[PDB]
Structure 1
Amino acid sequence: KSEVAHRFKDLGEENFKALVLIAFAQYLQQCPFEDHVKLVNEVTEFAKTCVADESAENCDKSLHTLFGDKLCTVATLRETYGEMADCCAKQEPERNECFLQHKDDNPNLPRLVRPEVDVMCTAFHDNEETFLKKYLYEIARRHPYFYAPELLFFAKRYKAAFTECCQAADKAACLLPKLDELRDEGKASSAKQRLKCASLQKFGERAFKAWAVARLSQRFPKAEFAEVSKLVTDLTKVHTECCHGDLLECADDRADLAKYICENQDSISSKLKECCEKPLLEKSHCIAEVENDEMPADLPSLAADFVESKDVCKNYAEAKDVFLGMFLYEYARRHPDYSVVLLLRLAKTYETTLEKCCAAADPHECYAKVFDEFKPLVEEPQNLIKQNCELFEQLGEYKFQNALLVRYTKKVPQVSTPTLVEVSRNLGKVGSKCCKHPEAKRMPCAEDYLSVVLNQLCVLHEKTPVSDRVTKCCTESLVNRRPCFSALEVDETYVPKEFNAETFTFHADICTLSEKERQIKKQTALVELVKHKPKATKEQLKAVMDDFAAFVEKCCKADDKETCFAEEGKKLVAASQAA
């Protein structure tokens, strides 16, 4: 009746206030902090109002309306936003769709920074509130499409950090490690959702639902197809809706989707019991990260319904897409251990098949050997996971990274050295954070991490194109992306680098540097070395890295550093060059 008083109630003034603020700071990305706060209090006062007397004037007004009605209050709306001010001329449904166009995705405001730990804690102290709010403000404006609720989620964590680290003795040592963790974590989520939306516009809905059908019926094996369909569909609207920038519709539909999933809890998953006990703002979040339920076991076989049984083509023809979804749902709920995209791949295959068979004399004998073709597809990833994990075992994380370094560098030598370093050590942590798991949960794992890394990689090659091959990959569908890379061969075109003493000239600094440092300086040298002599047999290289490993101990453990490095250095450089 007065949805605001309705939200204000289950949200709580705090949560209401911050949410309202972010919303205004993602639409009016230029107005000064103060002006927004005025708006926040302004809108809140009205909310408390409705909470008292629902019937009060305007309280019946829809949220988009209330919003777009207050958006059209700012006077410097035409001065500041110029064209956008026109929007106010339209009626709700259009007025809002209008504001959304003017949302500067990547605007031009100064980077952010990180004041002195001491200035911070002081700020955080004198005025707890305005301090946190301002930053919240700064961020939101720099990321107009970031999901509001989730931002608020980070918010409270921050607040914890400060009320925790600003009291200890060693401040910078209690806070800095967390501030860094909130950053990287925040940048993952930012990258994460931007990719999701990137997929939605490029390959569209159809594709998008396929992904959603797979993943969901993977997380909810016991739900009926009709049930998973609904979710997938509802779910698709939501994404489309946030990606557009509609904090509101996004927030509501998400709100509903969770209410629906929690009322029908027993009809979907047993892993939801906890999630649904939690408060409004926290359910959605809890559910999207829920563990997979466990499969029925008394499940039939796929062969029956999709390969043997005639009239297969008849079914497919009545509703080609509904049928494939069924195929997908079925195959998927039996394989938590598969990767969403692997499943998609098969799904793709099966589809292709049918089109090339249902128009034949005897179809039933045409597509009977389907399940065999899936074998190559399924084996391919599994090998790479087996092959690559074992190798990660023998060699510690660090040692395994070098391996990849030596691997990929030989693949794309043209890339920047520091680049390769980063893309590798990152690939290393994957093999660790994943292989530590049992089979069933490996691919899924690999896939979840690998997708961002491989993406992070594309963000860099695009900014500094060096090779087409890597570009070719980064542009192909999301399904092929990964395969496209595993398909890269050693570069025989490349013409080795010319020796550069200083490149291999190591002084005594690495001795007192933190492991992370030593490792980097070391790894850099390696990459370089492989750029100098690409035809280096796996053997040769180790040989080299070993003398070096020791070389480093023999010098930092000597009484005369710098002299040991300079003297013993020409010796390693020679013997090496000798191979």
Structure 2
Amino acid sequence: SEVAHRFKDLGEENFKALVLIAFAQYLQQCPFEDHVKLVNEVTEFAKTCVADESAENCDKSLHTLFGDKLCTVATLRETYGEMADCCAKQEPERNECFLQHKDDNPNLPRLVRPEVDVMCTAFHDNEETFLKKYLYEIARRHPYFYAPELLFFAKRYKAAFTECCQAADKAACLLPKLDELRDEGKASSAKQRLKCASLQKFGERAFKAWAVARLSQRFPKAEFAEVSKLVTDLTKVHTECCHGDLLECADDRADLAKYICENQDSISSKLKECCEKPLLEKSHCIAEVENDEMPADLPSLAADFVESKDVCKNYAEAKDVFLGMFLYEYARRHPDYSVVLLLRLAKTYETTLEKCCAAADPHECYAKVFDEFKPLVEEPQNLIKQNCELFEQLGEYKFQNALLVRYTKKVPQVSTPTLVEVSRNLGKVGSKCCKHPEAKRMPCAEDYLSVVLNQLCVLHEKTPVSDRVTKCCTESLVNRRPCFSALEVDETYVPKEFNAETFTFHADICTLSEKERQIKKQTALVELVKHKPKATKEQLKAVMDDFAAFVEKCCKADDKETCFAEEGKKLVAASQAA
């Protein structure tokens, strides 16, 4: 009895919430009421199994149990489409089919959040329906959100309404918290999206390597085997969540969390506070734990990896273990290196051994291996310090502007709305990582960019418009950053015409926040680049400054829609002389 085993383990509430999330992730189009029914029906059946694991139908796989429930209301293509195809299949075909039909960007209108009064009123009405509403919406919009974690954001989302609706300044208490939960949410969904992509597109070997690096950095004092034991467990966990097995993913996570807390003195000394918290807070806390203090006098690596007499004998015997040790030792010693950079150094070490080991004089051939690392560690450091400077001088706004052009000229074929989004998000890598010193920078920046870039890829996958994007996206997962920054001006691309209505601003612009107004401009800028790429340098910076001043004036011209109307369908060629 599996459904029963997971129900007794996780507890009713978490079980209910997880199944609802599994349902909102498969059918992101079905209404909240529909899913609620199905989830409450699965929870019944789950109880009948807890009271009789031998009861008819209680020993069949979760895929069967859950897949059956989904096919009770999936033969309605007039609202779904090809999900009926999945039902005419037997497990695990039916399961893999569903997963494959997870829409990264559903045709779902972002949900503008009501006022504090409205929300708090709705919350106090039916506290359960309110929260389930939350889970439903999040999951269906982010089909690859880390399930267990989502439950954690729901526990804090509730608590935020729990403490703020009983407050003096309800909006002052609730909004900064709802904004933060929103930021940490996207973040959690994106950062997980990348993990699922790693496992699904590059295999388990890949993710395990990533984990080994990230975990060796976080628990530098832990022994290799304790790290290895953790990487295996963590991988099994993410493999389930990414494969839609949420109930077993949360179960195994919790078990892994238990292990970690029971073995602190062998993993990290930063975990003591984490291992106080309730299970949901504990888990989130552990994944957010700060790197431990690196053990003091660490030894040279060249000893066991370069001068040793067994290097090649060891690299041949167990390559995954020898290299794992190399990554573990190099990672733990460099919490200042991005995970990707660490993986590159590992790949370098590997290749030079693959070459040298079978040579006449191996020991002399790879004798300078470590020297190859230098230009690999510096390239990113330099590009950072430089970009960070540029960022300090341009401000986030003018920095996104610079990146808007750089990336619009790189892949013109990409949607303008999509260019503005990705560019703006990438420009946020300046504000979010330049604040840290050159010690915490690379891992901050480069790993964040990995996420934004992965998001780009998975978004481009749907409707591909550039083979260059698809290249970088499908090639090495580790080098996606370098590959993207690599790209140069696309001289091929042909001008997007010139719709004189695309360069005509209206009154409605004057009542938007400065952020919106910036988006409006950045959008027009992308278009300007599309209509005149190749030949255009900081002469765009001249038109960009002319739009800001031109809008600033019109929004204060005692205007009657005029300043913008006339100086719009006719002022275009004024500035369009260049």
TM-score, reference length from structure 2: 0.80
In structure 1, C-alpha distance between the alignment counterparts of 2:144 and 2:233, rounded to whole Å: 20
Range with greater deviation from structure 2 (343-352 or 541-550): 541-550
Q: Structure 2 vs 1, CA of residues 7 and 457 (structure 1 numbering), >3 Å: closer, same or farther? A: closer
Q: Contact 1:117–1:171 (CA<8 Å) still a contact in 2? A: yes
Q: Contact 1:473–1:484 (CA<8 Å) still a contact in 2? A: yes
Q: Contact 2:2–2:59 (CA<8 Å) still a contact in 1? A: yes
Q: How does 1:177-576 map to 2 (within 5 A)?
A: 182=181, 185-536=184-535, 538-559=537-558, 563-565=562-564, 573=572, 576=575
Q: Contact 1:64–1:248 (CA<8 Å) still a contact in 2? A: no
Q: Contact 2:15–2:247 (CA<8 Å) still a contact in 1? A: no
In structure 2, C-alpha distance between the alignment counterparts of 1:78 and 1:572, rounded to whole Å: 50
Q: CA deviation at 1:555?
A: 3.9
Q: Structure 2 vs 1, CA of residues 327 and 24 (structure 1 numbering), >3 Å: closer, same or farther? A: same
Range with greater deviation from structure 2 (440-449 or 545-554): 545-554
Q: Contact 1:498–1:532 (CA<8 Å) still a contact in 2? A: yes
Q: Structure 2 vs 1, CA of residues 82 and 292 (structure 1 numbering), >3 Å: closer, same or farther? A: same
In structure 1, C-alpha distance between the alignment counterparts of 2:510 and 2:73, rounded to whole Å: 60
1:539-560 CA deviation, whole Å, 9 max, x = no partner?
4333333344434444444455
In structure 2, C-alpha distance between the alignment counterparts of 1:406 and 1:81, rounded to whole Å: 39
1:196-229 CA deviation, whole Å, 9 max, x = no partner?
1221132212222111111111111111212212
Q: Structure 2 vs 1, CA of residues 490 and 16 (structure 1 numbering), >3 Å: closer, same or farther? A: closer
Q: CA deviation at 1:241?
A: 3.0
Q: CA deviation at 1:138?
A: 6.8
Q: Structure 2 vs 1, CA of residues 508 and 38 (structure 1 numbering), >3 Å: closer, same or farther? A: closer
Match of 1:78 in 2: 77
In structure 2, C-alpha distance between the alignment counterparts of 1:547 and 1:323, rounded to whole Å: 60
Q: CA deviation at 1:511?
A: 3.6
Q: Contact 2:74–2:87 (CA<8 Å) still a contact in 1? A: no
Q: CA deviation at 1:354?
A: 1.1
1:416-452 CA deviation, whole Å, 9 max, x = no partner?
2222222211111111111111111111111232122
Q: Structure 2 vs 1, CA of residues 45 and 498 (structure 1 numbering), >3 Å: closer, same or farther? A: closer
In structure 2, C-alpha distance between the alignment counterparts of 1:543 and 1:529, rounded to whole Å: 12
Q: CA deviation at 1:290?
A: 1.0
Q: CA deviation at 1:362?
A: 1.0
Q: Structure 2 vs 1, CA of residues 89 and 480 (structure 1 numbering), >3 Å: closer, same or farther? A: closer
Q: Contact 1:410–1:491 (CA<8 Å) still a contact in 2? A: yes
1:363-411 CA deviation, whole Å, 9 max, x = no partner?
1111112122222222221222122111001111111111111222222
Range with greater deviation from structure 2 (34-43 or 141-150): 34-43
Range with greater deviation from structure 2 (10-19 or 184-193): 10-19
Range with greater deviation from structure 2 (124-133 or 469-478): 124-133
Q: Contact 1:10–1:280 (CA<8 Å) still a contact in 2? A: no
1:476-499 CA deviation, whole Å, 9 max, x = no partner?
121121121111011222333544
Range with greater deviation from structure 2 (29-38 or 13-22): 29-38
Q: Structure 2 vs 1, CA of residues 316 and 11 (structure 1 numbering), >3 Å: closer, same or farther? A: closer
Q: Contact 2:446–2:481 (CA<8 Å) still a contact in 1? A: no
Q: CA deviation at 1:140?
A: 5.9
* Consecutive unaligned residues in structure 1, runs of 5 or more: none
Q: Structure 2 vs 1, CA of residues 276 and 3 (structure 1 numbering), >3 Å: closer, same or farther? A: farther
Q: Contact 2:457–2:473 (CA<8 Å) still a contact in 1? A: yes
Q: Structure 2 vs 1, CA of residues 284 and 562 (structure 1 numbering), >3 Å: closer, same or farther? A: closer
Q: Structure 2 vs 1, CA of residues 205 and 192 (structure 1 numbering), >3 Å: closer, same or farther? A: same
Q: Residue 276 of structure 1 aligns to a residue in which SS?
A: coil
Range with greater deviation from structure 2 (308-317 or 534-543): 534-543
Range with greater deviation from structure 2 (82-91 or 161-170): 82-91
In structure 1, C-alpha distance between the alignment counterparts of 2:104 and 2:462, rounded to whole Å: 18
Q: Structure 2 vs 1, CA of residues 12 and 535 (structure 1 numbering), >3 Å: closer, same or farther? A: closer
Q: Contact 1:412–1:491 (CA<8 Å) still a contact in 2? A: yes
Range with greater deviation from structure 2 (251-260 or 15-24): 15-24
1:118-160 CA deviation, whole Å, 9 max, x = no partner?
7765543333334434554676688776554333222233334
* Consecutive unaligned residues in structure 2, runs of 5 or more: none
Q: Contact 2:64–2:91 (CA<8 Å) still a contact in 1? A: yes
Q: Contact 2:26–2:102 (CA<8 Å) still a contact in 1? A: yes
Identity in percent: 100
Q: CA deviation at 1:519?
A: 1.2
Q: Contact 1:11–1:280 (CA<8 Å) still a contact in 2? A: no
In structure 2, C-alpha distance between the alignment counterparts of 1:164 and 1:50, rounded to whole Å: 37
Q: Contact 1:214–1:343 (CA<8 Å) still a contact in 2? A: yes
Q: Structure 2 vs 1, CA of residues 20 and 341 (structure 1 numbering), >3 Å: closer, same or farther? A: closer
Range with greater deviation from structure 2 (244-253 or 232-241): 244-253
Q: Structure 2 vs 1, CA of residues 416 and 314 (structure 1 numbering), >3 Å: closer, same or farther? A: same
In structure 1, C-alpha distance between the alignment counterparts of 2:509 and 2:500, rounded to whole Å: 17
Q: CA deviation at 1:292?
A: 0.6
Q: CA deviation at 1:174?
A: 7.6
Q: Structure 2 vs 1, CA of residues 343 and 246 (structure 1 numbering), >3 Å: closer, same or farther? A: same
In structure 2, C-alpha distance between the alignment counterparts of 1:333 and 1:165, rounded to whole Å: 41
In structure 2, C-alpha distance between the alignment counterparts of 1:93 and 1:4, rounded to whole Å: 17
1:101-131 CA deviation, whole Å, 9 max, x = no partner?
9999999999988789877655433333344
Q: Structure 2 vs 1, CA of residues 362 and 183 (structure 1 numbering), >3 Å: closer, same or farther? A: same
Q: Contact 1:276–1:283 (CA<8 Å) still a contact in 2? A: yes
Range with greater deviation from structure 2 (38-47 or 78-87): 78-87
Q: CA deviation at 1:242?
A: 2.8
Over aligned residue pairs, what C-alpha RMSD do you find?
Answer: 5.3
In structure 2, C-alpha distance between the alignment counterparts of 1:507 and 1:195, rounded to whole Å: 40
Range with greater deviation from structure 2 (144-153 or 24-33): 24-33
Q: Residue 330 of structure 1 aligns to a residue in which SS?
A: helix
In structure 2, C-alpha distance between the alignment counterparts of 1:210 and 1:482, rounded to whole Å: 18
Range with greater deviation from structure 2 (472-481 or 182-191): 182-191
Q: CA deviation at 1:5?
A: 11
Q: Contact 2:147–2:246 (CA<8 Å) still a contact in 1? A: yes
Q: Structure 2 vs 1, CA of residues 438 and 573 (structure 1 numbering), >3 Å: closer, same or farther? A: same
Q: CA deviation at 1:273?
A: 1.0
Q: CA deviation at 1:318?
A: 2.2
Q: Contact 1:218–1:333 (CA<8 Å) still a contact in 2? A: yes
Q: Contact 2:105–2:459 (CA<8 Å) still a contact in 1? A: no
In structure 2, C-alpha distance between the alignment counterparts of 1:121 and 1:204, rounded to whole Å: 45
Q: Residue 215 of structure 2 aligns to a residue in which SS?
A: helix
Q: Contact 2:6–2:251 (CA<8 Å) still a contact in 1? A: no
Q: Contact 2:261–2:275 (CA<8 Å) still a contact in 1? A: yes
Q: CA deviation at 1:35?
A: 10
TM-score, reference length from structure 1: 0.80
Q: CA deviation at 1:267?
A: 1.7
In structure 2, C-alpha distance between the alignment counterparts of 1:95 and 1:522, rounded to whole Å: 46
In structure 2, C-alpha distance between the alignment counterparts of 1:552 and 1:139, rounded to whole Å: 37
In structure 2, C-alpha distance between the alignment counterparts of 1:389 and 1:538, rounded to whole Å: 21
Q: Contact 2:472–2:484 (CA<8 Å) still a contact in 1? A: yes
Q: Structure 2 vs 1, CA of residues 12 and 334 (structure 1 numbering), >3 Å: closer, same or farther? A: same
Range with greater deviation from structure 2 (118-127 or 296-305): 118-127
Q: Structure 2 vs 1, CA of residues 297 and 494 (structure 1 numbering), >3 Å: closer, same or farther? A: same
Q: CA deviation at 1:293?
A: 0.9
Q: Structure 2 vs 1, CA of residues 14 and 565 (structure 1 numbering), >3 Å: closer, same or farther? A: closer
Q: Contact 1:555–1:561 (CA<8 Å) still a contact in 2? A: no
In structure 2, C-alpha distance between the alignment counterparts of 1:448 and 1:283, rounded to whole Å: 24
